[PDB]
Structure 1
Amino acid sequence: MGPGFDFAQAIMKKNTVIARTEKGEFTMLGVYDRVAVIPTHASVGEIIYINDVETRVLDACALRDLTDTNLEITIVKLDRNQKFRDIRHFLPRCEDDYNDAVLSVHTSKFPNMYIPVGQVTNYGFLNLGGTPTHRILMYNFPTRAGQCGGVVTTTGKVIGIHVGGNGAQGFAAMLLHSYFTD
């Protein structure tokens, strides 16, 4: 409808796949080469489904900060025959607050879904499903089951991936440039 949705759409059309694990279906953001991100609670194994195709998981790491604190960011390298468009230049370098963000989801259940979530707060610490978690972004929208892995963008930046909610607020794990400096 406007330049927020235009940027969100451009990312979803080239840089997302549908990932299925034993824990369900997730929006999964491709970042560069065969490297993608998913919420750690997806429990990625040796094998994953990518757009309903059996795919070997070449390499995988759950990111924890330098106090061994869960971040909720799992980086996956997929045994896929095709690279993602490199979008690392759209990643913030620092922890920050943002205005006018969009959460975009693409699954079998919620295709081509875009939610204007508005202002995003650098929330920091969250007890997320019982797990102490750092670098959480918060937005005041009542996000539901099915949105985990959803991409959070502003015009020009990919800032995080949706990892949970409390019925009134939604929460995303920050994406930082530093996570993907190969």
Structure 2
Amino acid sequence: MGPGFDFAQAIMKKNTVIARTEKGEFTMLGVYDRVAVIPTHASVGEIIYINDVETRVLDACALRDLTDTNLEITIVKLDRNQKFRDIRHFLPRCEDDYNDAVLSVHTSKFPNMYIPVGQVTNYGFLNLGGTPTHRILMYNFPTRAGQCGGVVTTTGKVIGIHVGGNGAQGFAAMLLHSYFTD
């Protein structure tokens, strides 16, 4: 409808796949080459389904901060025959608050879904499903089961991936440029 949804759509159409693990279907953001991200609660193994095709996982790393606290981001390298468009220049360098964000989801259940979630707070610490978690972004939208792995954007920036909610608020793990240096 506007430049927010325009930027979100541009990311969804070229930089997302549908990932299936034994824990369900997730929106999965491709970042560069064969490297993507997914919530750590997806429990990625040696094999994953990418758009319903059996795919070997070449590497997977559940990120933690230097306090050894969960970040809820898993970086996955896929044995795929095709690279993602490199979107690392759209990643923030620092932890921040944002205005006017969009959460975008693409699964079998929720194809072509875009949610204007509004103001995003640098919330920080969250007890997420019983697990102490750092670098959490919060937005005041009643997000539901099916939205995990959803991409949070502003005009010009890819800022996080949706990892949970409490029925009134939704929570995203930050994406930082420093996670994807090579």
**TM-score strictly above 0.5:** yes
Unpaired runs of 5+ residues, structure 1, are none
Per-residue deviation, 1:81: 0.0
Cα distance in structure 1, aligned partners of 2:51 and 2:91: 25
Per-residue deviation, 1:138: 0.1
Cα distance in structure 2, aligned partners of 1:73 and 1:60: 10
Runs in 1 of length 4+ with deviation above 3 angstroms? Answer: none
Per-residue deviation, 1:88: 0.1
Per-residue deviation, 1:72: 0.2
Per-residue deviation, 1:145: 0.1
Task: Say yes or no: does 1:28 pair with 2:28.
Answer: yes
Per-residue deviation, 1:20: 0.1
SS at match of 2:5: helix
SS at match of 1:83: coil
SS at match of 1:124: strand
Correspondence for 2:8: 8
Cα distance in structure 1, aligned partners of 2:68 and 2:149: 22
SS at match of 2:179: helix
Cα distance in structure 1, aligned partners of 2:72 and 2:109: 23
Cα distance in structure 1, aligned partners of 2:35 and 2:99: 28
Correspondence for 2:114: 114
Per-residue deviation, 1:111: 0.1
Cα deviation code 1:141-181 (max 9, x no counterpart): 00000000000000000000000000000000000000000
Correspondence for 2:47: 47
Per-residue deviation, 1:45: 0.1
Q: What aligned pairs does 1:86-165 form with structure 2 within 5 A after superposition?
A: 86-165=86-165
Paired residues, number: 182
Cα distance in structure 2, aligned partners of 1:73 and 1:180: 12
Q: Name the TM-score, length of structure 2 as normaliser.
A: 1.00
Per-residue deviation, 1:102: 0.0
Cα distance in structure 1, aligned partners of 2:6 and 2:61: 31
Cα distance in structure 2, aligned partners of 1:134 and 1:67: 10
Q: Name the TM-score, length of structure 1 as normaliser.
A: 1.00
Cα distance in structure 1, aligned partners of 2:150 and 2:75: 15
Cα deviation code 1:32-54 (max 9, x no counterpart): 00000000000000000000000
Cα deviation code 1:73-101 (max 9, x no counterpart): 00000000000000000000000000000
Cα distance in structure 1, aligned partners of 2:103 and 2:160: 9
Correspondence for 1:37: 37
